[PDB]
């Protein structure tokens, strides 16, 4: 029960690919292209490193995933020639990201096929062809297109409605997409010690706390609570932690300005951070 | 838990070093070409202390000047040192009263003197103290550190020799006294009424 991650059965010249080493030979290293349904490949002895290499075991470490570009492809003999000395870190990291998103797509579609109890691999191939490759061709970008399409369809299932698989199949796919790729939950917490030893001490502290809490945006209520008599804690479970940290920093700055205006003292015990 | 803190009393409120201490504080006396304050600061830093308070009264200017040029006052030091001076200090009790007055500490700080040579890591002792405090709900107030030794060692001076009666199963101090000039030690019976199961005299 397996299928290719992309529509092409064989990679084209100069495509950076994930491989998994399985043995060693005189020519080089046998591998299996993971996203091409475990077809065997070859990393040549003469392309392992830019420098002078002594042995195969120096760098291969059989049993480990590796990011290798391809130079020569021969489909009639099933010969695919790879190379490591030509890849670069940027290509390596983008290949890893592309591979992991394609793996997530394959995992969700395999789960759909399993929950629909398709024993034959041809049925799984048909399901993977109807949904993934349609969007991949529509966006003209293999790998990226499918993952982006499911990410968009997790919120609005209108795109997934155009699929012509089935009603139960569509329901299962929607449920899997909404239960797998919708982990939107983040908490930003901070601690601030603000107090004023003035005439209206408690009043100024309450006013500063209210002014800080008023800066809370929609779907992000800053639940300020008193941890210790001199120190309060701001906690807010809001997604998009990149914006949450900025919101917490702005609220802390506003509270500090309000406290300093009321002739008081304020300090930041702990900066905003995730839970 | 908050970062570990430490109160470092940089002035011994007793004159055991006349006339040497009349022109140089005992804290700045070179032991092995290195001042005692450096040794105790290194001990505090190596054991995980992240904030240190030095309370120096006698010749506090020299101590301040020496500390400011030391390694621990650099911006790269993980042990932040705060220098507080006052001419009104007369004893360690005054230092602790000032600490409570200004509320320097929040929980489970370290009390050491400015002339302590050590390499002790207090991680296990601190964990035991915190666990005991959590289980007993704020009953254990202090955990004193002792070193296994022999009465005949040169380090065991007659002045600071101490005999301690403890509960062997919970490491609780039940009685504590100094043996300066005493040829015979005495222990009250009230020790044995509570922890009759086990009592040790060390």
């Amino acid at each position: 029960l397996s299928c290719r991650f992309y529509q092409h059965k064989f990679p084209e010249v100069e495509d950076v690919v994930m491989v998994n080493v399985r043995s060693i030979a005189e020519m080089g290293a046998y591998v299996s292209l993971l996203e091409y349904n475990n077809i065997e490949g070859m990393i040549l002895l003469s392309e392992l490193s830019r420098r002078r290499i002594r042995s195969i075991n120096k760098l291969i470490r059989i049993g480990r995933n590796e990011c290798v570009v391809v130079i020569r492809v021969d489909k009639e003999k099933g010969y695919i020639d790879l190379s490591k000395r030509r890849v670069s870190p940027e290509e390596a990291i983008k290949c890893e990201d592309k591979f992991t998103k394609s793996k997530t797509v394959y995992s969700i579609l395999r789960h759909v096929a399993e929950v629909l109890e398709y024993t034959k691999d041809e049925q799984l191939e048909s399901l993977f062809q109807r949904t993934a490759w349609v969007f991949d061709d529509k966006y003209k970008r293999p790998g990226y297109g499918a993952y982006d399409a499911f990410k968009h369809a997790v919120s609005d299932p209108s795109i997934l409605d155009s699929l012509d698989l089935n009603e139960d199949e569509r329901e299962v796919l929607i449920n899997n997409i909404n239960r797998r790729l919708t982990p939107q939950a983040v908490k930003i917490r901070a601690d601030i010690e603000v107090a004023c030893y003035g005439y209206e001490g408690i009043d100024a502290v309450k006013e500063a706390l209210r002014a800080g809490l008023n800066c809370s945006t929609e779907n992000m209520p800053i639940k300020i609570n008193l941890i210790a008599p001199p120190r309060y804690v701001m906690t807010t479970t809001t997604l998009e932690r990149t914006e949450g940290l900025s919101v917490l920093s702005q609220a802390m700055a506003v509270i500090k300005e309000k406290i300093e205006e009321k002739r008081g003292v304020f300090n930041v015990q702990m900066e905003p951070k995730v839970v | 838990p908050p970062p570990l803190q430490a109160v470092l009393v940089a002035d011994s409120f007793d004159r055991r070093f006349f006339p040497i201490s009349k022109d140089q504080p005992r804290v700045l006396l070179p032991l092995a070409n290195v001042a005692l304050i450096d040794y105790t600061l290194e001990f505090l830093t190596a054991t995980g202390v992240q904030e240190t308070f030095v309370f120096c009264c006698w010749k506090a200017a020299q101590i301040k000047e020496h500390l400011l040029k030391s390694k621990w006052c650099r911006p790269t030091s993980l042990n932040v040192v705060r220098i507080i001076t006052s001419e009104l200090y007369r004893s360690l009790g005054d230092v602790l009263r000032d600490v409570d007055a200004k509320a320097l500490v929040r929980s489970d700080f370290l009390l050491v003197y400015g002339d302590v040579i050590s390499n002790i890591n207090i991680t296990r002792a601190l964990e035991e103290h915190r666990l005991r405090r959590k289980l007993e709900k704020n009953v254990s107030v202090m955990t004193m550190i002792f070193k296994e030794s022999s009465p005949s060692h040169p380090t065991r001076c007659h002045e600071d020799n101490v005999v301690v009666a403890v509960d062997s199963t919970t490491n609780r101090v039940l009685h504590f006294q100094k043996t300066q000039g005493l040829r015979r030690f005495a222990f009250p019976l009230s020790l044995f009424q509570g922890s009759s199961d086990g009592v040790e005299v060390r």
């Binding site: 030979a25 005189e26 020519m27 003999k77 010969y79 | -």
Partner: protein, 356 residues
């Protein structure tokens, strides 16, 4: 496919990790007469390895390379395949069968590695006939420059050490030592040779006959009596089946003993070997890697009775027939190669300069 040869008798507990066969048991009794799985040339080569018709390391390497040239000549590339990989994949079972017939030697291992490298380097865009001809020519050049010219150079180098009126002690049978002695005698050196032999092969009679036919005065004795003749021996010249990367010399079973006894009598030790027998592996004893010959070869007739006739009946009785030993580098003075006269510790250095 080809089955596995059956172990014969009971092995020593310390040598239980090595295969031990019998000469009577042949692996070809379970293979088709017009052999298909194994090439007929390889079948004949394995048959004459197992029966002992080819013994010397140089002879074994030459026979392997000849049979391998025949295999390459008969080889035809399958459709929809590449020669540079199919040839190696086809050759591997032949090597496994040859190992089953008799464990491979260092020279054969080096030759196999050389041919694997040569085949791997064959271009994918060249004609089959050209590739086959180039492989045959490469095998011929390897044989020439690694045996013939090497032996000539080693003889020329060893002519310097051999002086007039000295005594040279040789052990076992080796073509290099015999050629060195014969050439030295031809050029005008006058000397004696003492031949040391050992059971059960008794292959020192080959070099004894060669020296007698060459006209060199010779003496013959068994190895236990070696300590008797070393007082009048001036040099100990030995042949090596392999040189290891740590300097240790792998050779016949008695060789190391001689070196030791030579060290007891203050006699210089020379080892002559060709550089293609240099091995990058290392071993410190004759236990981790060796070959157990037929135990029944240890039986000897002393009078009218054979003591070890039915040795299988005694359950606690074991026989081992070792064929190799390892000599530490501190018991060897000279190594004579086609590169020149080197110390015993320069073996890796040569291995470094022959690989680049």
């Amino acid at each position: 496919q080809v089955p596995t040869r059956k172990d014969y008798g009971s092995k020593v507990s310390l040598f239980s990790h090595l295969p031990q066969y019998s000469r009577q048991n042949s692996l070809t009794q379970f293979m088709s007469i017009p052999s298909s799985v194994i090439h007929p040339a390889m079948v004949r080569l394995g048959l004459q390895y197992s029966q002992g018709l080819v013994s010397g390391s140089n002879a074994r390497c030459i026979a392997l390379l000849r049979a391998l040239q025949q295999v390459i000549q008969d080889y035809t590339t399958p459709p929809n395949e590449e020669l540079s990989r199919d040839l190696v994949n086809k050759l591997k079972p032949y090597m496994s069968f040859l190992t089953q017939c008799r464990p491979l030697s260092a020279s054969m291992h080096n030759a196999i590695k050389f041919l694997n490298k040569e085949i791997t380097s064959v271009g994918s865009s060249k004609r089959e006939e050209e590739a086959k001809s180039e492989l045959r020519a490469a095998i011929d050049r390897y044989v020439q420059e690694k045996i013939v010219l090497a032996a000539q150079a080693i003889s020329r180098f060893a002519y310097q050490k051999i002086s007039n009126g000295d005594v040279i002690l040789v052990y076992g049978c080796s073509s290099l030592v015999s050629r060195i002695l014969q050439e030295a005698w031809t050029e005008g050196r006058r000397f004696r040779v003492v031949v040391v032999d050992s059971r059960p092969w008794l292959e020192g009679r080959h070099t004894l006959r060669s020296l007698v036919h060459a006209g060199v005065p010779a003496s013959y004795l068994l190895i236990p009596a070696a300590s008797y003749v070393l007082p009048e021996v001036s040099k100990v010249l030995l042949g090596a089946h392999a040189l290891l990367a740590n300097g240790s010399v792998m050779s016949r079973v008695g060789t190391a003993q001689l070196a030791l006894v030579a060290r007891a009598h203050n006699v210089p030790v020379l080892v002559c070997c060709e550089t293609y027998k240099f091995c990058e592996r290392v071993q410190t004893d004759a236990f981790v890697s060796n070959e157990l010959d037929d135990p029944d070869d240890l039986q000897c007739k002393r009078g009218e009775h054979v003591a070890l006739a039915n040795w299988q009946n005694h359950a606690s009785l074991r026989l081992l027939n070792l064929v190799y030993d390892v000599t530490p580098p501190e018991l060897v003075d000279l190594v004579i190669t086609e590169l020149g006269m080197i110390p015993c510790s320069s073996v890796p250095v040569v291995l470094r300069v022959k690989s680049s």
